[PDB]
Amino acid sequence: LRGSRLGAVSYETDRNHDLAPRQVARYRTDNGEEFDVPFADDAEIPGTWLCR
């Protein structure tokens, strides 16, 4: 038998010396906890976010 994980796997080399700029936005929840989310420089940051 053979199957699939409903996905795909590749082998492109991972790099960290050249990465996109991140403008992290921090969201505060009603319960008082705060969570940070890194978004690209394109902005369009949503006013509300579903946290962890």
Q: Select from 17, 26, 34, 44 the one that contacts other proteins (CB under 8 A).
A: 44
Q: Name the region of 18 (left: φ>0; alpha: ψ -120 to 50; beta: rest).
A: beta
Q: Check residue 3 for interaction with other proteins (CB under 8 A).
A: yes
* Cβ pair 3, 20 in contact under 8 A: no
Q: Does 19 bind other proteins (CB under 8 A)?
A: yes
- What's the alpha-carbon Rg for the chain, to the nearest Å? 17
Out of 17, 26, 31, 37, name the contact with other proteins by CB under 8 A.
37
- Reading the block at residue 4, the tokens are 């699939």
- Chain positions contacting other proteins, by CB under 8 A: 1-16, 18-20, 22, 37-40, 44-46, 50, 52
